[PDB]
């Protein structure tokens, strides 16, 4: 690799800068917190009546599991137009408030 970095075949006497050494990872750990419970997403999407525009409904959601599998199955494909995040990464990133 000294011959590779000088682009030659007969390197001269001296000191060179070949590359750098990185300690590689050994294993992997995934430790999001110990919480488990089915989410109230079924009320907000399968509600019979929604509120009007001028007085729109309020919902607080907490202590769930963020399952985003039934979203594509309740209705056919339509727009998402998702700004902060891509729509397909929602499960991995985890959610705050």
């Amino acid at each position: 690799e000294t011959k590779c970095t000088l682009k030659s075949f007969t390197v001269e006497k001296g000191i060179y800068q070949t590359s750098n050494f990185r300690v590689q990872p050994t294993e992997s750990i995934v430790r999001f917190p110990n919480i488990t419970n089915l989410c109230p997403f079924d009320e907000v999407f399968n509600a019979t009546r929604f509120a009007s525009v001028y007085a729109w409904n309020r919902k607080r959601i907490s202590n769930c599991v963020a399952d985003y599998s039934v979203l594509y199955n309740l209705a056919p494909f339509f727009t998402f137009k998702c700004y902060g995040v891509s729509p397909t990464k929602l499960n991995d990133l985890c959610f705050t408030n």
Binding site: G84, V85, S86, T88, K89, D92, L93
Partner: peptide, 8 residues
């Protein structure tokens, strides 16, 4: 890379 998809 975790949030958005690869193209944008």
């Amino acid at each position: 890379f975790s949030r958005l998809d690869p193209p944008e």
